[PDB]
Amino acid sequence: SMSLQVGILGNTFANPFMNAAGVMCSTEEELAAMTESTSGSLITKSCTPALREGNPAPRYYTLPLGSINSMGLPNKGFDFYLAYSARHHDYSRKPLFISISGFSAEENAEMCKRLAPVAAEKGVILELNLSCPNVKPQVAYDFDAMRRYLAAISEAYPHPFGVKMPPYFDFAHFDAAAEILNQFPKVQFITCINSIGNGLVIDVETESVVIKPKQGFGGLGGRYVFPTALANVNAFYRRCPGKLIFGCGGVYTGEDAFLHVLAGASMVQVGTALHEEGAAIFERLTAELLDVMAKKGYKALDEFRGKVKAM
Amino acid sequence: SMSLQVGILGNTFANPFMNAAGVMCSTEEELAAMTESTSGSLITKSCTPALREGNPAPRYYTLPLGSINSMGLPNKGFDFYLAYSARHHDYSRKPLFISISGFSAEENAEMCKRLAPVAAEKGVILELNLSCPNVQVAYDFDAMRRYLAAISEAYPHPFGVKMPPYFDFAHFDAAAEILNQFPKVQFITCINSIGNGLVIDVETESVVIKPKQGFGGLGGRYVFPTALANVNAFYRRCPGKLIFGCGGVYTGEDAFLHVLAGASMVQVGTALHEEGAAIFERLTAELLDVMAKKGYKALDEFRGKVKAM
Ligand SMILES: Cc1cc2nc3c(=O)[nH]c(=O)nc-3n(C[C@H](O)[C@H](O)[C@H](O)COP(=O)(O)O)c2cc1C
Ligand SMILES: Cc1cc2nc3c(=O)[nH]c(=O)nc-3n(C[C@H](O)[C@H](O)[C@H](O)COP(=O)(O)O)c2cc1C
Ligand SMILES: O=C(O)c1cc(=O)[nH]c(=O)[nH]1
Ligand SMILES: O=C(O)c1cc(=O)[nH]c(=O)[nH]1
């Protein structure tokens, strides 16, 4: 009688889980692995108009409670991911998201013009990255830029799309960002959050930073970011009730996923933990979330989505 | 041969450890325990012109990786901490910092005026809280410039600033550019809690603290990489000032990393709340241990010497 199904965006998802953009989604072999997994969906690596090798290595490092990265958007180029969406993805398995991360509003609109007919025919769904912190400061920490990008994309792209947001840390920013997003009818989902930007890890033995780019500063993922991610999910759930919220950050167990959904998440994305465990993690996360709901008597996610209680 | 001593602000500190403002420093008894502890120094609860009861409880919550709090600046009032600094603190034990967190520039100035006689006579050192997130001036640069100007005109002594965490180099540069205009700012404390996190309990399906719909500042293991980044960012950009590190310290190795990033003093919040003042005995031993394994004899030998990667 229990169900993890999600019915949103004109699609049915078997469960709310998917990878986070950037993790296990850059090559055809990785995307096929995601498609073969039990995840409810998948999303491509954020892509640019041209292929990128990304930053010098080491550019990822495992931390005691998570991860730090300055990948620098290594990706096979937009044409590769468009071809994947248009020709290779098995949509009978699960819906597909494509993440784009052009370096200007014009670069993104040019990609969207070419994505539009493929999205129309095949059903791939756009997620626009406004929060890459490792290349070009983050568009979503500049509200005038943010508004410019959304205007340019909406003019260039006929379909609804979503946005990948950086974490904010005060209600003035939650309100300011929500005010802009609610003014764009095509923004139909908000993904909270990208990594916490520009953390720093130093090794005791070497006395040296652990990644090479940008003097060691890089984005934090994993358990470090979970309370921030929940806060952002719930702040935008409250302020943007006309849009869906996707939760991303710190998900290692079905209990973590349960809390994202209680904060308001429709879909739940998995980044650092998926890098560590591989795509069988989705078998564990569905079983664990179903165990949480069984002990509480819940039969469907809408029985508790967004229903976090106050004291 | 080895020493944890830190010579700054014209004082010799026995070691770099101290409580973080707000932890174990609100009552006469807590201040005494901190003075009796082996800490190199101590700092008072951020105080306000009048007494404050603070937010409705529960307003602190222990987490497995740290803490979330929405205290609400509960404090005995500035007069109490000034009287403590004036008469009751044994300065022969260790130096004393006083934290002030007035709700405007004029409130902070008038407090500083009343504090300046006591600073001069007794040597208490001011830390100006620009980053309280539970009732942040340092997230608005125009306001932070105006606070520092008002303080510098009203206060004839050096002081320091407690900074919120920043998350990109544009904000690091802008904050440093402002701080570097004010020579009376002789130290910068990085960081205050990461603001407006949210924790929910699986069993109750409810937020775990009562104020502000459950949103509050994060401390402890969550914040350590952000704390190190902020310490090092301001160490690089403010070479003419001292950096105090605060954030995620549970062990001597944690303190060692803060010093490599640039910290002169190392403040302890969440771990001290959990462990009590005996933590400073463990922390000095552990840091001396790391130094001994590496042949270091003084903190000046590796403060800020993090290598590239
Ligand atoms: C190695 C790595 C690469 C990433 N690449 C992207 C990316 O291309 N686009 C994006 O929107 N986020 C990217 N992210 C951020 C993740 O999507 C996610 O927002 C963040 O890691 C928090 O989730 P987590 O705690 O499960 O790791 C990347 C994260 C990592 C660790
Ligand atoms: C219960 C509690 C009360 C605090 N009160 C203050 C305060 O009054 N003034 C201040 O500048 N910081 C205050 N802080 C922030 C701490 O000084 C410190 O910046 C933060 O907890 C991060 O350090 P940690 O990871 O070791 O806890 C408080 C933190 C906690 C947990
Ligand atoms: O490619 C990357 O460096 C990257 C992009 C992004 O959006 N987020 C992240 O953490 N890393
Ligand atoms: O009193 C508080 O709520 C408080 C103040 C402050 O500056 N930082 C913090 O975490 N809590």
Author numbering:
A (entry chain B): 0 to 134, 137 to 312
B (entry chain A): 0 to 134, 139 to 312
Paste lines from the article.
Among its key enzymes, dihydroorotate dehydrogenase (DHODH) is a flavoenzyme that catalyzes the fourth step and serves as a rate-limiting factor in the de novo pyrimidine biosynthesis of parasites. It facilitates the stereospecific oxidation of the (S)-dihydroorotate (DHO) isomer to orotate (ORO) via a ping-pong mechanism.
ORO was identified as an LbDHODH inhibitor with an IC50 of 61 ± 1 μM, a significant inhibitory activity given the fragment-like size of orotate. Next, to validate the mechanism of interaction between LbDHODH and ORO and to identify specific moieties for potential modification to improve inhibitor potency, we solved the crystal structure of LbDHODH in a complex with orotate. This lack of density underscores the intrinsic flexibility of this region, which is functionally important for regulating access to the active site. In addition, the final model contains two FMN, two ORO and three glycerol molecules, four sulfate ions, and 588 solvent sites treated as water oxygens. The analysis of ORO binding profile reveals stacking interactions with FMN and an extensive hydrogen bonding network. Similarly, the other oxygen at carboxylate group (O72) is an acceptor of a hydrogen bond with the main chain nitrogen atoms of Met70, Gly71, and Asn133. ORO atoms O2 and O4 also participate in hydrogen bonds with the oxygen (OG) and nitrogen (ND2) of Ser196 and Asn128, respectively.
